[PDB]
Design a protein around this motif. Sequence first.
Motif, PDB file in Angstrom:
ATOM      1  N   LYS A 131       0.806  -1.214   0.000  1.00 55.08           N
ATOM      2  CA  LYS A 131       0.000   0.000   0.000  1.00 55.08           C
ATOM      3  C   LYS A 131       0.841   1.267   0.000  1.00 55.08           C
ATOM      4  CE  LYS A 131      -4.019   2.112   0.257  1.00 55.08           C
ATOM      5  NZ  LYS A 131      -3.478   3.487   0.071  1.00 55.08           N
ATOM      6  N   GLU A 132       2.033   1.243   0.596  1.00 49.89           N
ATOM      7  CA  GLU A 132       2.893   2.417   0.606  1.00 49.89           C
ATOM      8  C   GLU A 132       3.411   2.785  -0.779  1.00 49.89           C
ATOM      9  OE1 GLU A 132       6.329   2.759   0.097  1.00 49.89           O
ATOM     10  OE2 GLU A 132       6.791   0.666  -0.362  1.00 49.89           O
ATOM     11  N   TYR A 133       3.446   1.833  -1.716  1.00 47.65           N
ATOM     12  CA  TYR A 133       3.824   2.154  -3.088  1.00 47.65           C
ATOM     13  C   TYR A 133       2.789   3.039  -3.769  1.00 47.65           C
ATOM     14  CZ  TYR A 133       7.532  -1.355  -2.795  1.00 47.65           C
ATOM     15  OH  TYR A 133       8.656  -2.069  -2.443  1.00 47.65           O
ATOM     16  N   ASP A 134       1.507   2.844  -3.458  1.00 46.00           N
ATOM     17  CA  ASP A 134       0.424   3.681  -3.963  1.00 46.00           C
ATOM     18  C   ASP A 134      -0.178   4.445  -2.791  1.00 46.00           C
ATOM     19  OD1 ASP A 134      -0.781   4.265  -6.569  1.00 46.00           O
ATOM     20  OD2 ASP A 134      -2.666   3.617  -5.648  1.00 46.00           O
TER      21      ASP A 134
ATOM     22  N   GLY B  54      -5.478   6.583  -3.789  1.00 43.62           N
ATOM     23  CA  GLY B  54      -6.408   5.557  -4.216  1.00 43.62           C
ATOM     24  C   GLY B  54      -6.552   5.444  -5.719  1.00 43.62           C
ATOM     25  N   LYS B  55      -5.586   5.986  -6.468  1.00 38.82           N
ATOM     26  CA  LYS B  55      -5.652   5.900  -7.923  1.00 38.82           C
ATOM     27  C   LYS B  55      -5.508   4.460  -8.398  1.00 38.82           C
ATOM     28  CE  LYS B  55      -0.736   6.928  -8.715  1.00 38.82           C
ATOM     29  NZ  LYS B  55      -0.588   5.448  -8.685  1.00 38.82           N
ATOM     30  N   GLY B  56      -4.695   3.663  -7.704  1.00 36.35           N
ATOM     31  CA  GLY B  56      -4.601   2.245  -7.962  1.00 36.35           C
ATOM     32  C   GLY B  56      -3.731   1.842  -9.132  1.00 36.35           C
TER      33      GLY B  56
ATOM     34  N   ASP C 174       7.822  -1.096  -9.249  1.00 37.47           N
ATOM     35  CA  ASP C 174       7.294  -1.114  -7.891  1.00 37.47           C
ATOM     36  C   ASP C 174       6.595  -2.432  -7.593  1.00 37.47           C
ATOM     37  OD1 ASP C 174       8.302   1.383  -7.436  1.00 37.47           O
ATOM     38  OD2 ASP C 174       6.390   2.284  -6.840  1.00 37.47           O
ATOM     39  N   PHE C 175       5.900  -2.996  -8.582  1.00 29.05           N
ATOM     40  CA  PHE C 175       5.235  -4.282  -8.397  1.00 29.05           C
ATOM     41  C   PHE C 175       6.248  -5.384  -8.099  1.00 29.05           C
ATOM     42  CE2 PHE C 175       2.062  -7.537  -9.214  1.00 29.05           C
ATOM     43  CZ  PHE C 175       0.876  -6.895  -8.925  1.00 29.05           C
ATOM     44  N   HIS C 176       7.331  -5.428  -8.878  1.00 34.31           N
ATOM     45  CA  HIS C 176       8.384  -6.411  -8.665  1.00 34.31           C
ATOM     46  C   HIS C 176       9.075  -6.232  -7.323  1.00 34.31           C
ATOM     47  CE1 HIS C 176      11.171  -9.497 -10.098  1.00 34.31           C
ATOM     48  NE2 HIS C 176      12.146  -8.780  -9.568  1.00 34.31           N
ATOM     49  N   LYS C 177       9.344  -4.991  -6.913  1.00 35.70           N
ATOM     50  CA  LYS C 177       9.907  -4.776  -5.584  1.00 35.70           C
ATOM     51  C   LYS C 177       8.927  -5.199  -4.495  1.00 35.70           C
ATOM     52  CE  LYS C 177      10.835  -0.402  -6.328  1.00 35.70           C
ATOM     53  NZ  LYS C 177      10.654  -0.289  -7.798  1.00 35.70           N
ATOM     54  N   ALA C 178       7.634  -4.928  -4.698  1.00 39.69           N
ATOM     55  CA  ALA C 178       6.634  -5.199  -3.673  1.00 39.69           C
ATOM     56  C   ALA C 178       6.470  -6.692  -3.436  1.00 39.69           C
ATOM     57  CB  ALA C 178       5.298  -4.568  -4.066  1.00 39.69           C
ATOM     58  N   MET C 179       6.348  -7.476  -4.510  1.00 37.18           N
ATOM     59  CA  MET C 179       6.153  -8.912  -4.315  1.00 37.18           C
ATOM     60  C   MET C 179       7.409  -9.581  -3.773  1.00 37.18           C
ATOM     61  SD  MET C 179       3.827  -9.887  -7.574  1.00 37.18           S
ATOM     62  CE  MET C 179       5.061  -9.991  -8.860  1.00 37.18           C
ATOM     63  N   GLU C 180       8.585  -9.080  -4.149  1.00 34.30           N
ATOM     64  CA  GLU C 180       9.823  -9.598  -3.584  1.00 34.30           C
ATOM     65  C   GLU C 180       9.982  -9.249  -2.113  1.00 34.30           C
ATOM     66  OE1 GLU C 180      12.542 -11.689  -4.904  1.00 34.30           O
ATOM     67  OE2 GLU C 180      10.593 -12.103  -5.830  1.00 34.30           O
ATOM     68  N   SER C 181       9.559  -8.050  -1.701  1.00 35.20           N
ATOM     69  CA  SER C 181       9.579  -7.705  -0.284  1.00 35.20           C
ATOM     70  C   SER C 181       8.554  -8.521   0.493  1.00 35.20           C
ATOM     71  CB  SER C 181       9.323  -6.208  -0.105  1.00 35.20           C
ATOM     72  OG  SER C 181       8.014  -5.858  -0.524  1.00 35.20           O
ATOM     73  N   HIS C 182       7.397  -8.788  -0.119  1.00 35.70           N
ATOM     74  CA  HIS C 182       6.387  -9.617   0.529  1.00 35.70           C
ATOM     75  C   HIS C 182       6.893 -11.037   0.740  1.00 35.70           C
ATOM     76  CE1 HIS C 182       1.862 -10.841   0.787  1.00 35.70           C
ATOM     77  NE2 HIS C 182       2.323 -10.429   1.954  1.00 35.70           N
ATOM     78  N   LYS C 183       7.803 -11.495  -0.127  1.00 37.57           N
ATOM     79  CA  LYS C 183       8.555 -12.747  -0.018  1.00 37.57           C
ATOM     80  C   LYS C 183       7.679 -13.959   0.285  1.00 37.57           C
ATOM     81  CE  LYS C 183      10.075 -11.325   4.618  1.00 37.57           C
ATOM     82  NZ  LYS C 183       9.463  -9.980   4.438  1.00 37.57           N
ATOM     83  N   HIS C 184       6.378 -13.863   0.000  1.00 36.13           N
ATOM     84  CA  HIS C 184       5.540 -15.057  -0.003  1.00 36.13           C
ATOM     85  C   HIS C 184       5.495 -15.695  -1.383  1.00 36.13           C
ATOM     86  CE1 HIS C 184       3.860 -12.849   3.570  1.00 36.13           C
ATOM     87  NE2 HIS C 184       4.039 -14.051   4.084  1.00 36.13           N
ATOM     88  N   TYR C 185       6.094 -15.044  -2.377  1.00 38.26           N
ATOM     89  CA  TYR C 185       6.159 -15.548  -3.740  1.00 38.26           C
ATOM     90  C   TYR C 185       7.599 -15.907  -4.075  1.00 38.26           C
ATOM     91  CZ  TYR C 185       1.377 -14.072  -4.858  1.00 38.26           C
ATOM     92  OH  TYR C 185       0.009 -13.931  -4.897  1.00 38.26           O
TER      93      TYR C 185
ATOM     94  N   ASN D 225       3.715   3.355 -20.214  1.00 37.53           N
ATOM     95  CA  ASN D 225       4.299   3.896 -18.995  1.00 37.53           C
ATOM     96  C   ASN D 225       4.800   2.818 -18.044  1.00 37.53           C
ATOM     97  OD1 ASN D 225       1.736   6.123 -19.516  1.00 37.53           O
ATOM     98  ND2 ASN D 225       3.832   6.898 -19.306  1.00 37.53           N
ATOM     99  N   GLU D 226       4.712   1.543 -18.432  1.00 38.97           N
ATOM    100  CA  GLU D 226       5.098   0.421 -17.572  1.00 38.97           C
ATOM    101  C   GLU D 226       4.372   0.480 -16.230  1.00 38.97           C
ATOM    102  OE1 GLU D 226       7.439   2.123 -19.291  1.00 38.97           O
ATOM    103  OE2 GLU D 226       8.230   0.613 -20.673  1.00 38.97           O
ATOM    104  N   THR D 227       3.080   0.792 -16.276  1.00 36.26           N
ATOM    105  CA  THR D 227       2.228   0.842 -15.099  1.00 36.26           C
ATOM    106  C   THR D 227       0.986  -0.010 -15.328  1.00 36.26           C
ATOM    107  OG1 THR D 227       1.083   2.843 -15.856  1.00 36.26           O
ATOM    108  CG2 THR D 227       3.047   3.140 -14.487  1.00 36.26           C
ATOM    109  N   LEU D 228       0.514  -0.643 -14.258  1.00 36.88           N
ATOM    110  CA  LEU D 228      -0.595  -1.583 -14.338  1.00 36.88           C
ATOM    111  C   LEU D 228      -1.640  -1.255 -13.282  1.00 36.88           C
ATOM    112  CD1 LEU D 228      -0.530  -4.005 -11.865  1.00 36.88           C
ATOM    113  CD2 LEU D 228       1.606  -4.512 -13.076  1.00 36.88           C
ATOM    114  N   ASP D 229      -2.891  -1.589 -13.592  1.00 38.73           N
ATOM    115  CA  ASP D 229      -3.999  -1.392 -12.662  1.00 38.73           C
ATOM    116  C   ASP D 229      -4.195  -2.670 -11.853  1.00 38.73           C
ATOM    117  OD1 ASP D 229      -6.114   0.360 -11.661  1.00 38.73           O
ATOM    118  OD2 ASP D 229      -7.500  -1.060 -12.597  1.00 38.73           O
ATOM    119  N   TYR D 230      -3.690  -2.673 -10.619  1.00 40.42           N
ATOM    120  CA  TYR D 230      -3.743  -3.891  -9.819  1.00 40.42           C
ATOM    121  C   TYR D 230      -5.167  -4.209  -9.384  1.00 40.42           C
ATOM    122  CZ  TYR D 230      -3.475  -0.482  -5.962  1.00 40.42           C
ATOM    123  OH  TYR D 230      -3.690   0.576  -5.109  1.00 40.42           O
ATOM    124  N   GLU D 231      -6.046  -3.202  -9.335  1.00 40.34           N
ATOM    125  CA  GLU D 231      -7.451  -3.481  -9.051  1.00 40.34           C
ATOM    126  C   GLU D 231      -8.066  -4.377 -10.119  1.00 40.34           C
ATOM    127  OE1 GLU D 231      -6.302  -0.313  -8.791  1.00 40.34           O
ATOM    128  OE2 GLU D 231      -6.648   0.241  -6.692  1.00 40.34           O
ATOM    129  N   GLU D 232      -7.920  -4.012 -11.393  1.00 39.41           N
ATOM    130  CA  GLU D 232      -8.447  -4.872 -12.443  1.00 39.41           C
ATOM    131  C   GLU D 232      -7.683  -6.181 -12.540  1.00 39.41           C
ATOM    132  OE1 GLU D 232      -7.309  -5.803 -15.689  1.00 39.41           O
ATOM    133  OE2 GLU D 232      -5.288  -4.988 -15.417  1.00 39.41           O
TER     134      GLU D 232
END
Length: 241
Positions: free
Chosen positions: A175-178, A181-183, A189-200, A217-224
């Motif tokens: 959540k700190e990456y975003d 609430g634009k989402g 940031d996604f790759h850093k986030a999942m690696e920090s979460h280290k459950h994957y 822009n190399e950006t994705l809508d994680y909500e969708e």
Amino acid sequence: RTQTGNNTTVNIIISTVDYLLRVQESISDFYWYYSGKDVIDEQGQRNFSKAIQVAKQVFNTLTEYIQGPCTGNQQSLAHSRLWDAVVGFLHVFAHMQMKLSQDSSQIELLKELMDLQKDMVVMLLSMLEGNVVNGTIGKQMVDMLVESSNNVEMILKFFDMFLKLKDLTSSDTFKEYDPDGKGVISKRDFHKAMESHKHYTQSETEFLLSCAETDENETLDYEEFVKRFHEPAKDIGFNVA
């Protein structure tokens, strides 16, 4: 199943299973044709949709045959050729789930496939209605599962990998990456986030990068992203559980 008064009896219940086996063989063959090809063209993609519609209707018909604990119909499907068709569908599902998810153009085909899988699992649950301890239907279904061991394992890994995404995207460390609430979040940031979460693991991380479409822009809508993947998983995996 049985016309008591008639001189001659025809087993419509078994004939339905025969047609289901015949159509699942064609679906498996068409899959094997499209396995090597990187992308499924429009004609093949629509033929998949039509065949999935037919198979879904047949599965619904079988479910209506067997529900209302119709023990005679349940016993008939137990000894019919239903298990081979189920194994074929399990193989097809285990591989198309891994193939179509990477591509961003077969989203509708993936949804149709997930609905077909859900109806197959509902049919299996309806088979398991009125079950007794150490019954024959349970023995045959576990035999089918053991025969399709690898496909079920791949399906379950798929489901777990896409069920952990809801927790990942609801975590504060993601959540700190975003901060707003634009989402919309970047791939870096996604790759850093999942690696920090280290459950994957690394393979899961790279598969999740592949399953996310890239914009300029190399950006994705994680909500969708999560609404596309988690919910079908949360439904079908619940039925499987």
